[PDB]
Ligand binder design. Structure first.
Ligand SMILES: CCCCCCCCCCCCCC(=O)O
Ligand SMILES: CCCCCCCCCCCCCC(=O)O
Lengths: 158, 158
């Protein structure tokens, strides 16, 4: 693996609801560079299932347009780690959250990697961004993006 | 203006020679996002003139290819500030350099802005990157990119 920061005592039910992708970082530039880059995904809502799986609603630019997407992250034996199914095993880790303001996560498959700082409101949270940059110093990131409140209220952060 | 960090006692003649754009940051995502983004420029060599102007040799992706470019930054009454001529006055500021290892600069024209961390060798200089991130905390950056030694040895950081 690469990420080695997870949240202890995570209650997944408590991450339900509205989120904003305030910032994103990735191990490779091409993961985040254009609007249609593979990991350029904007989180809209987290919906944990009664069984403790996590449905994710996001927006993604595909074929010159901002498309909705609904994804399932299946629980593992580790509360802070989930699995999306693909041609390749892709792992979601929750690094840190306070439920009410911010949540940091990374997704990972040379191993590749993207992380975001999620926030509850269309506001620049300097404190959440601090924690995001601290978490990222452990990691081989090569691109970082952040969004302003105006963009945060547009579909696909236009 | 926006940038408010310049190097005191700058000797421009001493920045002559080979440089590598190790990292870049900008105030707007669209300034750096694709390979043909307007401020995605890779520095190759600095050539200060006897009169104290600064010629810059760089590479830039334009029309699906990595083109060379030669640019003149004309001196001002301030040693650490130079001017490129365009439809709009565009200002180059030297923030910090030690001549032998690293140099930080910003270019600026809502005012927009891009900065790079230049290094003498195709090596990841953690120390130069520290200084770059410190300088950038004063600034409204929204995209940051960094390159690995393999890319640093390819034209247009391929
Ligand atoms: C607890 C935070 C969980 C957020 C997880 C976001 C995972 C989305 C990854 C989807 C990858 C790109 C989308 C796709 O093309 O399928
Ligand atoms: C002392 C460091 C000076 C480095 C200055 C680099 C200035 C290059 C800016 C050129 C902007 C894009 C190129 C172009 O399209 O003309």
């Amino acid at each position: 693996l690469i990420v080695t920061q997870t949240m202890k005592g995570l209650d997944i039910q408590k991450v339900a609801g509205t989120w904003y992708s305030l910032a994103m970082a990735a191990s490779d530039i091409s993961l985040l560079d254009a609007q249609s880059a593979p990991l350029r995904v904007y989180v809209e809502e987290l919906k944990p299932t009664p069984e403790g799986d996590l449905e994710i609603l996001l927006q993604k630019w595909e074929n010159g347009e901002c498309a909705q997407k609904k994804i399932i992250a299946e629980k593992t034996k580790i509360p802070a780690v989930f699995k999306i199914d693909a041609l390749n095993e892709n792992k979601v880790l929750v690094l840190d959250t306070d439920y009410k303001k911010y949540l940091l996560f990374c997704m990972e498959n040379e191993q590749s990697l993207a992380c975001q700082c999620l926030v509850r409101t269309p506001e620049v949270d300097d404190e959440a961004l601090e924690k995001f940059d601290k978490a990222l110093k452990a990691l081989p990131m090569h691109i970082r993006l952040s969004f302003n409140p105006t963009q945060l209220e547009e579909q696909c952060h236009i």
